[PDB]
Design a protein around this ligand. Sequence first.
Ligand SMILES: Cc1cc2nc3c(=O)[nH]c(=O)nc-3n(C[C@H](O)[C@H](O)[C@H](O)COP(=O)(O)OP(=O)(O)OC[C@H]3O[C@@H](n4cnc5c(N)ncnc54)[C@H](O)[C@@H]3O)c2cc1C
Ligand SMILES: CCCCCCCCCCCCCCCCCC(=O)O
Ligand SMILES: CCCCCCCCCCCCCCCCCC(=O)O
Length: 571
Amino acid sequence: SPVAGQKYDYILVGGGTAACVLANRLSADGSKRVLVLEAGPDNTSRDVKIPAAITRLFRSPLDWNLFSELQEQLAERQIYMARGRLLGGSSATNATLYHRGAAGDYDAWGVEGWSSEDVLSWFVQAETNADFGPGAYHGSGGPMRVENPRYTNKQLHTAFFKAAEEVGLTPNSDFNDWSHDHAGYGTFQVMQDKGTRADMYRQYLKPVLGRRNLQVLTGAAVTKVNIDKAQALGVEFSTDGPTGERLSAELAPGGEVIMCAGAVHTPFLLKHSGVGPSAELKEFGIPVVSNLAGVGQNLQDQPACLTAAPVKEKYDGIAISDHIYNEKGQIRKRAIASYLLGGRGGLTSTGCDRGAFVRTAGQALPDLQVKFVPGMALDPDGVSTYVRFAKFQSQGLKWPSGITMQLIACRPQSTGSVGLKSADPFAPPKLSPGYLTDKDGADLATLRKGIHWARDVARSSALSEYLDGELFPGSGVVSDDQIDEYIRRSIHSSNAITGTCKMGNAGDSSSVVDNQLRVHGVEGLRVVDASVVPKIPGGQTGAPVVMIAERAAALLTGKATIGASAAAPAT
Ligand SMILES: Cc1cc2nc3c(=O)[nH]c(=O)nc-3n(C[C@H](O)[C@H](O)[C@H](O)COP(=O)(O)OP(=O)(O)OC[C@H]3O[C@@H](n4cnc5c(N)ncnc54)[C@H](O)[C@@H]3O)c2cc1C
Ligand SMILES: CCCCCCCCCCCCCCCCCC(=O)O
Ligand SMILES: CCCCCCCCCCCCCCCCCC(=O)O
């Protein structure tokens, strides 16, 4: 009905992080008709704009509310896996931390044309940074906004740095500078513009909505790619939920469908389109279009656990929870005034503004990320405690002052899968994160050694000054066996999720897309989102997705090629 009689050069499945970048770049010269189909609503919520309102976005109508299959290895629990559902996708609901990982993460992909030297200029092209000018590792002029965090905690932020130094960690002045080793303690930069969330709807899509050649439809749930050698024709979707008419957006000749539904929903939709392992498609009577073993395999997510400690009575009031709420759960006037005048103070924080990367055991690259939060978790599940914090408003109760360190296996060895639990394209996917399944027990060992490292930091004189014991995991949890059980019972997502449509070299049989991001076995179909990441980089995955989308757009528009290897000579 909104697509009746129209033909599109590009159809983007999803209106999230990658899709916003692509919609901007592919509509720029005016020559191409671009359609965006997003299942969620428009990006208008105040809870998206204010960073500290991330607490309110978990388990909300702006989230997919996805739960994993029962995980036998995690005390038989379903794990919540947050995912944004609106224009800007997870960039609209994330913690805003700006991380690229290390040069070695991209070299470890081993994919032709996607070395660290190849991807660096695409990170730089996306970027405008308030604290780093143009240089080898930073750009100025690109649509993203990055800045140093605008919340300062007078006592706890430098206490964390001093404690990390007391345990023998060195400072890292810029976690995105590839001329330094990745390990160390330091500030985490944020995807914010003077304390306002700088999501990719705000930075890339919203500014170009006036373009006549760009059509964005919200409340548009894609059901499958229409495929006719298999050739993408366009995409089926409903604007009225499960009961709605199935509409079809049609490609113009030479048009492509670009999958941008993310690492959960892209492999899910491909399987619904007949692209995936033939056994999984036959199970639900889906005709096999491209028998592609890797679709929904290689799910990589960074699992997390935490330690938390209360401050001494004399330091009551020094935590970010005290800067946001008063003793009755009322949002503090100082926080509101600082946010609106100046774009500073506790509402500019998603909780962590600094942390560390750490080698627990002599690895080539850090296996552990540490997020320092100058507030105390009341649950060993950090995501649960954020939901508690949002619900705490106006309850007439005092949130106890303290600190938290979240421990993340940032380069995990475990993998999971995404598949189908039914033939209905409106049903949730069959989601298995696979945390702690790697054969050596490396991910469990990382998080166990993480807890020991967080304990050493909390015991150090610089932080010890403020603290009065330990809440989580607490006094009862000391032996390796007690720590491992705490981790199995409390492990939660740090919200990465990559690799389910993995890019690979010619000859890599686990590949779903080639180095041109083309889906094997289908013409005119590409994936441009976190699905394609071959091996997860250390740190949060949003900046890498924008880099991939920026480079994909340049390839599609003819401004760049990927893979510059000299042809072997004629003999
Ligand atoms: C809670 C949370 C915290 C995070 N913290 C950080 C962090 O601090 N820093 C950072 O860099 N990264 C962070 N990340 C990760 C980062 O946000 C993601 O890796 C990145 O945004 C993914 O981009 P994408 O384009 O692959 O997918 P998304 O941005 O998730 O976009 C996919 C889009 O597809 C839509 N969609 C799904 N199915 C359909 C359908 N059938 N039809 C139509 N549309 C559909 C979704 O609604 C969504 O809008 C976080 C993630 C979350 C969820
Ligand atoms: C508990 C989690 C934090 C909640 C934050 C909500 C703040 C509500 C107080 C009133 C906000 C007034 C300022 C309005 C700003 C709206 C967003 C923006 O335009 O940047
Ligand atoms: C915005 C302020 C919130 C204050 C909450 C109190 C402190 C709790 C810290 C929880 C520790 C782990 C952090 C969980 C982070 C959830 C979001 C994310 O995954 O980045």
